[PDB]
Design a protein around this ligand. Structure first.
Ligand SMILES: Nc1nc2ccc(F)cc2s1
Ligand SMILES: [Cl-]
Ligand SMILES: [Cl-]
Length: 163
């Protein structure tokens, strides 16, 4: 793992990450989708061979030797707040298992269920806290990707708060 495991946040295209593997905010059917999922499809299209997986799970497919971890957050349009929250926590726990199995020293990760799966709500804090619960016990350097200038500030603050 990383010598001093850390969290960082960058405001850029996750398709341009400088990490040893990437987490896709995937749909359950392995379709190209939109947002992060569309950029991942354009950069690593080979990774979508048999990528379909249920909500609350993660499935890794290699693009050459570069791992793409397809993590399926819930669509809060379809789920109750209670069941959506349980599936969102589960998806990040499956990501932590896959990152550990792969033996990577770093991972690029988006906030799951915060874009077109958010059901039109701000889920920054909900999704980030589930990311921390899952990844805190791993020793990989985690680099969180966002697009919004205000989200970059709010994620940076939440990382710095814990030290
Ligand atoms: N290509 C893209 N990368 C990201 C990374 C984070 C994000 F929130 C949106 C996008 S769209
Ligand atoms: Cl960029
Ligand atoms: Cl999303």
């Amino acid at each position: 793992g990383a010598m001093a495991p850390s969290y960082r946040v960058k405001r850029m295209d996750i398709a341009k990450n400088d990490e040893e593997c990437v987490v896709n905010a995937a749909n359950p059917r392995g379709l190209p989708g939109d947002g992060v999922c569309k950029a991942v499809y354009k950069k690593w299209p080979e990774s979508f061979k048999n990528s379909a997986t249920p909500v609350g799970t993660a499935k890794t497919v290699m693009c050459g030797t570069y791992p793409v971890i397809h993590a399926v957050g819930p669509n809060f349009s379809n789920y109750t707040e209670s069941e959506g929250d349980r599936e969102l926590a589960a998806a990040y726990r499956e990501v932590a298992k896959e990152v550990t199995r792969l033996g990577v020293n770093s991972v690029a990760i988006p906030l799951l269920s915060t874009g077109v799966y958010s059901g039109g709500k701000d889920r920054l804090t909900q999704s980030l806290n589930h990311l921390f619960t899952a990844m805190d016990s791993t020793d990989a350097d985690v680099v969180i990707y966002c697009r919004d200038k205000e989200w970059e500030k709010k994620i940076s603050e939440a990382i710095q708060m814990r030290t």
